[PDB]
Structure formats: C-alpha cells, structure tokens
Amino acid sequence: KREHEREVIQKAIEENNNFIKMAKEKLAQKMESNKENREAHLAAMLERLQEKDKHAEEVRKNKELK
C-alpha cells in the first residue's frame, strides 16, 4: 500500500512537470516560427523594392544610351 501511495504522488509530480515542459516547448516553437515568418515577409518586401530600384537605374541607362 505504501509503494502505491508513493507512486501516485510521483505520478502527479511527473504530470505537472510534463505540462510545464510541453507548454514551454510549444511557446518556443511558435515564437521562432512567427519570427522567421515575419522577417521573411520584410525581406521579400525589401527585395521587391530593390528590384524596382534596379529597373529605375536601367531606365536611366536607356535614356543615356539615346
């Protein structure tokens, strides 16, 4: 009977810990995924703008050519 008593309470301990663990990991995954995503978006908007800058340089070179 005493062992089972020690088993129950250790089970409840391990239950709580496991929850805290899973919680911590999940939050860490979602923070990094979001962070990557957001930076990607920003990096693509910047690259589009840079490609528009190059087109303007080329338009300026086309006029100079004539």
Binding site: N16, A23, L27, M31, S33, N34, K35, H41
Partner: protein, 439 residues
C-alpha cells in the same frame, strides 16, 4: 494566506480593474491613500482583505495586482487617477505601441517586448505572498492586447507557476461597442490558446450588460463606465468569499463543482438586483425576488438560453441580510415554478453561500444600494450558443480570408486560424456530448 494576484491586460482589463479595486476599497474601508482605519494591525495581518490587499509599515493597503497595457493612455489615467496613491508605480506597466487590434501583434510582435517585464512584476508580487492561491486575469477577447498578450501571459504563468490557479474575466465582444471588424478572429484565437491554461473562465457579454443598464438602470446609451461599474459588482460578489469571511463559502468549492470536465470551465453568471436609486426607494427586495431574478434570462451576463440546454451545476452566492431559511424557501419556490433541468450525471442541488457583508455602490453610481444581492453561477450547456455566434462570424470572414493578411504579416499562419476554429468546433461538440443523457 491564500493571496490572489490580479492581472489586468488591455484597456478593458485595466478599466474594469479600476472599477473593481475602487469597489473593493469601499467595501473594505480602505481609503484612497490606502490607509484602512478599521485595520489595527499595521504592516501585516491575516485578515480576509489581505488576500487581495497587501499592507505596509505606514498602514497603507496596496492592491495585489498589476496593470499591463501596451499603450500608456489607459494606465496613465490610473497613474493620475484618484486611486493613483493606492497603486504602486511598478504595478502599472505600459509600453508605447498597441497591437492595433491584432492578436498577432499583441502575442508576438509587441507582447514579446513587455512579456518578460510583466512576469517580472508578477513574480515580485508572488514573493510577497505567503501562500499564493492563483491569478485573476481580466481581459477582452476583441483587442490585440486583450487577446494576444493575454494568451502569452497565460502560457508564461503556466510554465513559471506550474499548475497554480488561473481564473479569468473575458469580455465577450458586443457589436454595439465593437471597435474592430476582426474581433471575432482575435476571440477564436485567444479562446483556443488559453483554453488549456485557464482553470475557470467567466465571460461577460457587453451586449448583455449594455441591455441590463438600459433596462434596469434606464440609461439611454450606457457607457463603458456603466458597464464597468455593473461588472465590478458581479466580480465583487464572486470574490467576496475571498476578501471577506459563517455562511460564506470559498469559491474553490464552487469551482470544484462548476468544472465537471476540464474544457467545460465557462460558468454562466446572473446577478440581482440591478435597480435604480429611485426604483429602489420604497421597494424592498426579498430573497425570493432576487432569487427569481437569478433565474431570469434577461439578468444573465452572457446572452444565451439556459432552457435550450441543461444545468451541470448551479450555485448561488448571496451577500447581505440573508438567512438560510429564506434562501431555502425561495429555492423551493423557484423549483416549483422553473424548469431547472440537470444532466443525469449531476446532482440537482443548489450550492449556496451567504456573506452577511452587505453590498456597496460607488458614489454617483446608477446602482441603488440594496440590503441584499445575489449572483448565481451556473454550468449550463447553453453557453455554447455564445461560441456559435462568434464562431459563425469567424467562419464568415475566414472563408474569404479577410483581414487574414494582417495576421500573416506579423508571422502567424493560416494553420493557426484553422486549428483554433477546429478546437472551437470540438468545444461545441463537447457541450453537446455532456448534455446527452447517460445510456
């Protein structure tokens, strides 16, 4: 002992927390400087009011709470408000930018900045407590701070405090006071996220409170101040077992009875009597009257029909000049007249508590002081209707993926949307399962 730390996220969180705290000062005899003349013990004590109010050498009784808002504006009025002396500067935490009604902005892009400082202030408060009981979080689903930062803080509290209690006072979005078209999105998403971290969630529909004020208080266009004052009365009745202490029953016992299963932790609340000071003059409201009122559907904080569903628990928390005998009579009467259907797995009883401390109304309030009030909390499957309505809005916009780009640019992903919605659909089916009669 059994301290409770109060956390107020967002504008709604903050304001509703200023209502509550004022009312709690008025009820406990705490002055605006925090000095409670009644309390002879200085710098400490074990009084019920110490679970919500800490003390200092000077006798000042500081509230145990933390006001966090990502825009200074709302907490700033607290800083400069009448009760600015009561609170302590660290307790007020304000960034510089709001989540522009975006869960994504409030959970990730902005929240992450202040989240660590917030948890920091909570932790300080937690060390003051000899035996902290749990947290009381006040927020609104519709706002980016009230959704995105609130869930974030819920996860953090889960991790850092483990399985300590975490109750909630969630402001159900109401079109009358709607501030954002995207509020259904934020609602689904926050409900999805905190569902696993909240021990017990009380929802308040602005629409329902807006109605109650127009009807019972005869206010033409109830303001957030009206709502808040009525809200604080409800909150105070629920927390009255903690702040005050023979017939009074600890809300834990109610909690052990209002959560049959972990996901079913949203109880309905109905308060009575809300009456104007003219109407209350020359009218005495019996225990039986207020008790009926509880079972009146227009008096409920959330708009849903309990008859459409079944009761899984029904508790009555009274306050004021009440005696067990009258409460027994009124209950019986009710029974005779009402159709309080209970799930078969649940005992058809009404848990009652009487807190003889009479109710108080803020000066210049539209609520008349009464000698008795009651607030019944019920775990009826009707609450689902709420979700439904919301969910349905969420589905309408999400089919055309509207405003979805605002979430995606912050880094969220449509997967999160669909997953959140699935979980709401499961929750709704869970309500239906619990109502099914046992084979």
């Amino acid at each position: 002992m059994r301290e409770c730390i109060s956390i107020h996220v967002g504008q709604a969180g903050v304001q509703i927390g200023n209502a509550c705290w004022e009312l709690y000062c008025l009820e406990h005899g705490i002055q605006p400087d925090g000095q409670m003349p009644s309390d002879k013990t200085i710098g400490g004590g074990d009084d019920s009011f110490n679970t919500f109010f800490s003390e200092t050498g000077a006798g000042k009784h500081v509230p145990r709470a933390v006001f966090v808002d990502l825009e200074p504006t709302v907490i700033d009025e607290v800083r400069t408000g009448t009760y600015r002396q009561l609170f302590h500067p660290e307790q007020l935490i304000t960034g510089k930018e709001d989540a522009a009604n975006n869960y994504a902005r409030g959970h990730y892009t902005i929240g992450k900045e202040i989240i660590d400082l917030v948890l920091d202030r909570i932790r300080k408060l937690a060390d003051q407590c000899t035996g902290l009981q749990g947290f009381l979080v006040f927020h609104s689903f519709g706002g980016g701070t009230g959704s995105g930062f609130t869930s974030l803080l819920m996860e953090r509290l889960s991790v850092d405090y483990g399985k300590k209690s975490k109750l909630e006072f969630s402001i159900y979005p109401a079109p009358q006071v709607s501030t954002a078209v995207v509020e259904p999105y934020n609602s689904i998403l926050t409900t999805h996220t905190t569902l696993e971290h909240s021990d017990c969630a009380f929802m308040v529909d602005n629409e329902a409170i807006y109605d109650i004020c127009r009807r019972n208080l005869d206010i033409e266009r109830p303001t957030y101040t009206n709502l808040n004052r009525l809200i604080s009365q409800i909150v105070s009745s629920i927390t009255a077992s903690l702040r005050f202490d023979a017939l009074n029953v600890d809300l834990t016992e109610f909690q052990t009875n209002l959560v049959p299963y972990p996901r079913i932790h949203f109880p309905l609340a109905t308060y009575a009597p809300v009456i104007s000071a003219e109407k209350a003059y020359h009218e005495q409201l019996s225990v039986a009257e207020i008790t009926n009122a509880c079972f009146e559907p227009a008096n409920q904080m959330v708009k849903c029909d309990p008859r459409h569903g079944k009761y899984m628990a029904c508790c009555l928390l009274y306050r004021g000049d009440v005696v067990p005998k009258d409460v027994n009579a009124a209950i019986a009467t009710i029974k005779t007249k009402r159709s309080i259907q209970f799930v078969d797995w649940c005992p058809t009883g009404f848990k009652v508590g009487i807190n003889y401390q009479p109710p108080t109304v803020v000066p210049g309030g539209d609520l008349a002081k009464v000698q008795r009030a009651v607030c019944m909390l019920s775990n009826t499957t009707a609450i689902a209707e709420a979700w439904a309505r919301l969910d349905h809005k969420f589905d309408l916009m999400y089919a055309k993926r509207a405003f979805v780009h605002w979430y995606v640019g912050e880094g969220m992903e449509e997967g999160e949307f669909s997953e959140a919605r699935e979980d709401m659909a499961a929750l709704e089916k869970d309500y239906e399962e619990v109502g099914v009669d046992s084979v």
